[PDB]
Design an enzyme around this catalytic site. Structure first.
Site, short mmCIF file in Angstrom:
data_model
loop_
_atom_site.label_atom_id
_atom_site.label_comp_id
_atom_site.label_asym_id
_atom_site.label_seq_id
_atom_site.Cartn_x
_atom_site.Cartn_y
_atom_site.Cartn_z
N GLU A 71 42.90 36.05 40.17
CA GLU A 71 42.45 34.77 39.68
C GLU A 71 42.42 34.63 38.16
O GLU A 71 42.40 33.53 37.64
CB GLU A 71 41.00 34.56 40.16
CG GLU A 71 40.91 34.38 41.66
CD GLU A 71 41.64 33.16 42.20
OE1 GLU A 71 42.08 32.26 41.58
OE2 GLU A 71 41.64 33.09 43.45
N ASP B 213 44.06 24.47 38.43
CA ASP B 213 44.55 25.58 39.18
C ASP B 213 46.00 25.30 39.59
O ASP B 213 46.58 24.32 39.16
CB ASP B 213 43.59 25.96 40.37
CG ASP B 213 43.71 25.00 41.51
OD1 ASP B 213 44.42 24.02 41.50
OD2 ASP B 213 43.03 25.31 42.57
N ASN C 276 54.31 37.58 59.94
CA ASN C 276 53.80 36.25 60.30
C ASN C 276 53.03 35.63 59.11
O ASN C 276 53.04 34.43 58.88
CB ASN C 276 52.84 36.43 61.49
CG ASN C 276 52.38 35.15 62.06
OD1 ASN C 276 51.35 34.58 61.70
ND2 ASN C 276 53.22 34.59 62.89
#
Ligand code: CL
Ligand code: CL
EC number: 3.2.1.17
Length: 162
Positions: free
Chosen positions: A11, A20, A132
């Site tokens: 972050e 962001d 996946n």
């Protein structure tokens, strides 16, 4: 390495309001303020979170305090979610940190929608789950970070984080 260092890497740390990757106003260590387009709404949400008139700027300690609270909330969200909890309890320490990161980034709701990957992680089918998880908007929008989390779920070690 631990969850705090891991999310600090993913972050970053910014002391002034910023946008962001989805263009939403955020501050600190990934602390989302609002999805509203208004900077004023952002500033109001920030003062309310910090408890003072910040004028869109905070100190390092204040950013760390919002971070501690957000990590704590993420964990508690996982423990309270009926789809998430079982997964999280079936995992080892490194992998549990992976699930906290995804929840910190995309919310409980979002992570709980990965039904098929969740089932594969619960079964410890690492390479299958890794494939996946990559078939997602998350992977296509923030590929570098998603690759680091996915590799960590695949190997169970902190290598991707150097
Ligand atoms: Cl808050
Ligand atoms: Cl990324």
């Amino acid at each position: 390495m631990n969850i705090f260092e891991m999310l600090r890497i993913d972050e970053g740390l910014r002391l002034k309001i910023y946008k962001d990757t989805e263009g939403y106003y955020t501050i600190g260590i990934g602390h989302l303020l609002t999805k509203s387009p208004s900077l004023n709404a952002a500033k109001s949400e920030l003062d309310k979170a910090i408890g003072r008139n910040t004028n869109g700027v905070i100190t390092k300690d204040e950013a760390e305090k919002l971070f501690n609270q957000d990590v704590d909330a993420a964990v508690r969200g996982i423990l309270r979610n009926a789809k998430l909890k079982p997964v999280y309890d079936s995992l080892d320490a490194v992998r549990r940190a992976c699930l906290i990161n995804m929840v910190f980034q995309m919310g409980e709701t979002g992570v709980a929608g990965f039904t098929n990957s969740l089932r594969m992680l619960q079964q410890k089918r690492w390479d299958e789950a890794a494939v996946n998880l990559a078939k997602s908007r998350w992977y296509n929008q923030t590929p570098n970070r998603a690759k680091r989390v996915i590799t960590t779920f695949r190997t169970g070690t902190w290598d991707a984080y150097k």
